[PDB]
Design an enzyme around this catalytic site. Structure first.
Site, mmCIF file in Angstrom:
data_model
loop_
_atom_site.group_PDB
_atom_site.id
_atom_site.type_symbol
_atom_site.label_atom_id
_atom_site.label_comp_id
_atom_site.label_asym_id
_atom_site.label_seq_id
_atom_site.Cartn_x
_atom_site.Cartn_y
_atom_site.Cartn_z
ATOM 1 N N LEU A 179 -24.155 -3.366 3.964
ATOM 2 C CA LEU A 179 -24.589 -3.381 5.352
ATOM 3 C C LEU A 179 -26.115 -3.258 5.509
ATOM 4 O O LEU A 179 -26.704 -4.033 6.254
ATOM 5 C CB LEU A 179 -23.889 -2.261 6.114
ATOM 6 C CG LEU A 179 -22.383 -2.373 6.285
ATOM 7 C CD1 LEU A 179 -21.865 -1.129 6.964
ATOM 8 C CD2 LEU A 179 -22.068 -3.590 7.111
ATOM 9 N N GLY A 180 -26.734 -2.281 4.830
ATOM 10 C CA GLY A 180 -28.189 -2.056 4.860
ATOM 11 C C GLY A 180 -28.594 -1.568 3.470
ATOM 12 O O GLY A 180 -27.841 -0.786 2.906
ATOM 13 N N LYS A 181 -29.758 -1.944 2.932
ATOM 14 C CA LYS A 181 -30.060 -1.571 1.536
ATOM 15 C C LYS A 181 -31.018 -0.419 1.093
ATOM 16 O O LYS A 181 -31.854 0.080 1.856
ATOM 17 C CB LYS A 181 -30.400 -2.883 0.729
ATOM 18 N N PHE A 229 -34.076 4.427 0.243
ATOM 19 C CA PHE A 229 -33.659 5.759 0.470
ATOM 20 C C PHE A 229 -32.148 5.826 0.196
ATOM 21 O O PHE A 229 -31.612 6.906 0.288
ATOM 22 C CB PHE A 229 -34.049 6.090 1.898
ATOM 23 N N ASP A 254 -35.215 6.384 15.814
ATOM 24 C CA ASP A 254 -34.833 5.006 15.545
ATOM 25 C C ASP A 254 -34.106 4.252 16.644
ATOM 26 O O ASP A 254 -33.149 3.530 16.378
ATOM 27 C CB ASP A 254 -33.995 4.948 14.271
ATOM 28 C CG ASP A 254 -34.580 5.790 13.154
ATOM 29 O OD1 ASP A 254 -35.809 5.721 12.908
ATOM 30 O OD2 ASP A 254 -33.790 6.521 12.515
ATOM 31 N N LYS A 301 -33.693 1.331 18.486
ATOM 32 C CA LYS A 301 -34.147 -0.035 18.376
ATOM 33 C C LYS A 301 -32.975 -0.978 18.233
ATOM 34 O O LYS A 301 -31.938 -0.633 17.667
ATOM 35 C CB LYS A 301 -35.144 -0.181 17.226
ATOM 36 C CG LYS A 301 -34.857 0.705 16.050
ATOM 37 C CD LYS A 301 -34.403 -0.123 14.888
ATOM 38 C CE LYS A 301 -35.584 -0.783 14.205
ATOM 39 N NZ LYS A 301 -35.971 -0.002 12.996
ATOM 40 N N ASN A 348 -30.304 -1.004 15.706
ATOM 41 C CA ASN A 348 -29.478 0.172 15.548
ATOM 42 C C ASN A 348 -28.380 0.217 16.610
ATOM 43 O O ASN A 348 -27.673 1.205 16.755
ATOM 44 C CB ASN A 348 -30.352 1.429 15.599
ATOM 45 C CG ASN A 348 -31.130 1.643 14.311
ATOM 46 O OD1 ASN A 348 -30.615 1.402 13.224
ATOM 47 N ND2 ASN A 348 -32.366 2.112 14.427
#
Length: 270
Positions: free
Chosen positions: A13-15, A18, A118, A120, A123
């Protein structure tokens, strides 16, 4: 106790910079979630207790040898960005709806002394019923980042940045584009700090008022930047037609319905 074996992997989904966020399905209930995986050494709670209708709920939290894991509820309607793309622009009412559900979530976080940082477009996801759901993954990379002026100048992450985030989100929702799309991202820093933001003529007087307020460079002068936080935003003209007790209650009717049968319908996942 929850473990890695209770889930089937589906897609990224997101890399990681972190950690990673991956879409998974709990083998026992067949329900879907987004698993956040944080590298313990690459990192060389508040979030977990903050429950709210328009905030993604944490389902499970477990640790592995060198990893931190957070299994979180995954909204079924697609990501707002996807929906904004198709419509190109939302009706000020459609925007007001979403803008209202965000303000609700933000008033709650601020009440608990939590600054979200966050808010935005990326998100934002829509749930099975078409209600907003704020997430902490990272979809899309090269999307122009729009940090608040006080962030760029003093690295100040006060609660005001959430209103700015809201402003940038509302703007793109009703303008179909980011405030400075017409200009390459290289000068985006000086722009955010010293450029007056322009609005489309078609913009209602009320909507131009909101954005100009949400986007003031001075945190203290920004709409929502004053001591009464969300009150200012809630009682701005743009939100006259809003019953705040109605929104947090999800009594309000989504301006748009996703098209998913139920939170199991792998449609929008693709």
């Amino acid at each position: 106790k929850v473990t890695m074996n209770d889930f089937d992997y589906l897609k990224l989904l997101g890399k990681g910079t972190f950690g990673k966020v991956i879409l998974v399905r709990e083998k026992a209930t067949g329900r879907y979630y987004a698993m956040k995986i944080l590298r313990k050494e690459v990192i060389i709670r508040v979030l977990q207790n903050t429950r709210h209708p328009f905030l993604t709920a944490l389902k499970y939290a477990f640790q592995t040898h060198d990893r931190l894991c957070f299994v979180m509820e995954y909204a079924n309607g697609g990501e707002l960005f996807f929906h904004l793309s198709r419509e190109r622009v939302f009706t000020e009412e459609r925007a007001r709806f979403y803008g209202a559900e965000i303000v609700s979530a933000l008033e709650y976080l601020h009440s608990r002394d939590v600054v979200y940082r966050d808010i935005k477009l990326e998100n934002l996801m829509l749930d099975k019923d078409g209600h907003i759901k704020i997430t902490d993954f990272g979809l899309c990379c090269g999307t122009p980042e729009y940090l608040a002026p006080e962030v760029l100048e003093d690295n100040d992450y006060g609660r005001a940045v959430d209103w700015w985030g809201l402003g940038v989100v509302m703007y793109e929702m009703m303008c179909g584009r980011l405030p400075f799309y017409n200009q390459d991202h290289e000068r985006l820093f000086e722009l955010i700090l010293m450029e007056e933001i322009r609005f489309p003529r078609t913009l209602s007087p009320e909507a131009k008022s909101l954005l100009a307020g949400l986007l003031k460079k001075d945190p203290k002068q920004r709409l929502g930047g004053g001591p009464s936080d969300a009150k200012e935003v809630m009682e701005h003209r743009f939100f006259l037609s809003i019953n705040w007790q109605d929104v947090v209650q999800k009594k309000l009717l989504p301006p748009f319905k996703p098209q998913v049968t139920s939170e199991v319908d792998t449609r929008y996942f693709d």
